[PDB]
Structure formats: structure tokens, C-alpha cells
Amino acid sequence: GMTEYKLVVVGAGGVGKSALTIQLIQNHFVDEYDRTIEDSYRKQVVIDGETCLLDILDTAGQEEYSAMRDQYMRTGEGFLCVFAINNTKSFEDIHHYREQIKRVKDSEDVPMVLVGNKCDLPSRTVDTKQAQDLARSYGIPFIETSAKTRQGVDDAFYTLVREIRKHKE
Ligand SMILES: Nc1nc2c(ncn2[C@@H]2O[C@H](COP(=O)(O)OP(=O)(O)NP(=O)(O)O)[C@@H](O)[C@H]2O)c(=O)[nH]1
Ligand SMILES: [Mg+2]
């Protein structure tokens, strides 16, 4: 049968977790206008020649909401850790999300991808090489994305699936 992947998108408020998830699943960019909440989004894709089902949990970046935190972190198979390249604080916050995940999973080897989003904007304060250097320290892939243009979006999620598959040997 088809394998399903429970992917969890985490990161600071406003970095574009929802917009990435909606661009991946629905192929359009949300900004000014209203939208209905779902929080869990599903998609069939072919990655490296194997069809699979993606189940994406789009988490809140507000720290005051975390009832599901140890929940959705416990049920997730891999994590997209998102910061925005114009938000130094959200890049600094990656450490805290990676530590939360490691604790909840009780593992030093959790499938994860570091995502630097909003790479269409000119106001960059996080250098690509600095984020690459951090991802190398963790041993995980780094991808730059734009939910506005779709640059990198498929690649970020598919790379996470490839990390889960590699882990599962
Ligand atoms: N220029 C640009 N703006 C983006 C990009 N991704 C998201 N945004 C904008 O940034 C804002 C925050 O995006 P949103 O997806 O709601 O962020 P979030 O991480 O889910 N927020 P929260 O943690 O509050 O749930 C929105 O105005 C959205 O249009 C991107 O790649 N480029
Ligand atoms: Mg959101």
C-alpha cells in the first residue's frame, strides 16, 4: 500500500509556515485575503519514483499555544524547521525547536530539514552561508524557499521525505 509521511512544520511566528504548506498543497500564495483554517493537509506525490501520501501539520509559532506540542512533535516523522531570511530572531530560534524535537523524540537523529523562507525579499539579515554552516553542524539539509514565488517549496518537502526514508534504514 502507499506509504504516508507525517511531516510537521515548525518555526517562529510569521516565518511563513502556513504559506509554505498552502503553496505546496494548493499551489497559491496567501497574504492579504481571508482563509479557512484546517491545520492538517494531505497530498499524493511521486518522489524518486515512489508514490506516497504527505500529511502535513502546520503548527502555530505562538509560544502561548503548545497543547499539542509534545503531541504533534510525538506523532511527526519528520520536521521542517523554518526561519525567515529577513528575521534574525526566527533563525536564532531554530535551536530551541531542534532541542524540543530531540527531547520529545528521545533521539539525536530525527529527520529534519532547515528551511530559510522569504528568499524573494531584499531585506536579508541571515546569510545563506551562516544557515548552511548551522545545518552542517546538525547534519541536516538546508534549503532556501519562497512561498510567494514557489522557489524551493517542493524541494524542501521532498528532501524531508528523503531524510525520513534514509532514516528508516
Ligand atoms: N514575501 C514573502 N512573504 C511571505 C512568504 N511566506 C509568507 N509570507 C508572508 O508572511 C506573513 C506570515 O505568513 P504565514 O504563513 O501566516 O506565517 P506563519 O509562520 O504560519 N505564522 P504563525 O506562526 O502566526 O502561524 C504573511 O503576510 C505571508 O503572506 C514568502 O516566501 N515571501
Ligand atoms: Mg500559520
State this model's resolution in angstroms.
Answer: 1.9
d(C-alpha 143, C-alpha 151), whole Å: 10
d(C-alpha 77, C-alpha 32), whole Å: 32
142, 148 contact by CB (below 8 A): no
How far, CA to CA in Å, does 124 sit from each of 31, 76, 85, 164?
19, 30, 5, 30
Count CB-CB contacts under 10 A for residue 123.
9
Count CB-CB contacts under 10 A for residue 94.
23
d(C-alpha 11, C-alpha 94), whole Å: 7
- Looking from the CA of residue 61, the nearest atom of ligand 1 is 23
d(C-alpha 152, C-alpha 116), whole Å: 10
In the numeric block, the cell 533563525 is attached to 91
CA of 102 to the centre of ligand 2 (A): 23
Burial class (CB in 10 A: 0-12, 13-18, 19+), 122: exposed
- Looking from the CA of residue 22, the nearest atom of ligand 1 is 15
Residue having the nearest C-alpha atom to atom 25 of ligand 1: 60
Closest-CA residue to 161 (of 46, 74, 22, 67): 46
Residues with CB under 6 A from ligand 1: 13-19, 30-31, 60-61, 117-118, 120-121, 146-148
d(C-alpha 116, C-alpha 55), whole Å: 21
d(C-alpha 118, C-alpha 137), whole Å: 23
**Which domains does the chain possess?**
1-169 (3.40.50.300)
Element (H, E) at 69: helix 69-75
- Looking from the CA of residue 59, the nearest atom of ligand 1 is 25
**Residue 110: DSSP 8-state:** -
Q: Give the strand pairing for 112-117 and 78-84.
A: parallel
Burial class (CB in 10 A: 0-12, 13-18, 19+), 10: buried
